[PDB]
Amino acid sequence: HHMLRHNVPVRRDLDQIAADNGFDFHIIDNEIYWDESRAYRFTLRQIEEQIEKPTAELHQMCLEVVDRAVKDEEILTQLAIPPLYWDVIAESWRARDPSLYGRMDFAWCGNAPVKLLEYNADTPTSLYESAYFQWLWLEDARRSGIIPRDADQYNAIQERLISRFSELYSREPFYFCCCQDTDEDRSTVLYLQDCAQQAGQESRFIYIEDLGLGVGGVLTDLDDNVIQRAFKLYPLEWMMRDDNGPLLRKRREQWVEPLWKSILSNKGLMPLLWRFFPGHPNLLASWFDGEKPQIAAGESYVRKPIYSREGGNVTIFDGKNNVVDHADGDYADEPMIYQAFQPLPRFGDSYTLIGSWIVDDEACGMGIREDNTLITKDTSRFVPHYIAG
Q: What are phi and psi of 107, to 5 degrees?
A: -95, 120
User: Is residue 207, in this structure, part of any structural domain at all?
Assistant: yes
> Could you tell me if 352 and 385 are in contact, meaning their C-beta atoms sit under 8 angstroms apart?
no
Strands 301-305, 229-233: pairing kind? unpaired
Give the burial string for 197-209 (b: 16+ CB within 10 Å, else e).
Answer: eebebebbebebe
How many CA atoms are closer than 13 Å to the CA of 173, on its beta-carbon side? 12
User: Is residue 293, in this structure, part of any structural domain at all?
Assistant: no
Query: Distance (Å, rounded) from C-alpha 65 to C-alpha 359?
Result: 18
Least Cα distance to 56 among 376, 377, 360 occurs for 360
Give residue 214's region: left, alpha or beta (phi > 0; psi -120 to 50): beta
Give the technique used to solve this structure: X-ray
Beta bridge partners of 28: 31
> Could you tell me if 344 and 376 are in contact, meaning their C-beta atoms sit under 8 angstroms apart?
yes
Please report, in range form, the residues annotated as the binding site for ATP: 103-105, 267, 304, 311, 339, 374-376
User: Is residue 328, in this structure, part of any structural domain at all?
Assistant: no
Resolution in A: 1.9
> How many separate domains does the chain show?
1
User: Is residue 311, in this structure, part of any structural domain at all?
Assistant: no
> Cβ contacts of residue 278 below 8 Å, gap of 6+?
none
Query: Distance (Å, rounded) from C-alpha 282 to C-alpha 209?
Result: 40
> Could you tell me if 192 and 231 are in contact, meaning their C-beta atoms sit under 8 angstroms apart?
yes
> Could you tell me if 340 and 356 are in contact, meaning their C-beta atoms sit under 8 angstroms apart?
no
User: Is residue 322, in this structure, part of any structural domain at all?
Assistant: no
Please report, in range form, the residues annotated as the binding site for Mg(2+): 105, 118, 120
User: Is residue 295, in this structure, part of any structural domain at all?
Assistant: no
Give the burial string for 221-259 (b: 16+ CB within 10 Å, else e).
Answer: beeeeebeebbbbbbbbebbeeeebebbeeeeebbbbbb
Query: Distance (Å, rounded) from C-alpha 316 to C-alpha 49?
Result: 29
Please report, in range form, the residues annotated as the binding site: 103-105, 118, 120, 267, 304, 311, 339, 374-376
> Could you tell me if 11 and 18 are in contact, meaning their C-beta atoms sit under 8 angstroms apart?
no
Give the burial string for 287-318 (b: 16+ CB within 10 Å, else e).
Answer: bbeeeeebbeeeebbbebbbbbbbbbbbbbbe
Range(s) of the domain holding residue 370: 4-266+346-387
User: Is residue 219, in this structure, part of any structural domain at all?
Assistant: yes
User: Is residue 315, in this structure, part of any structural domain at all?
Assistant: no
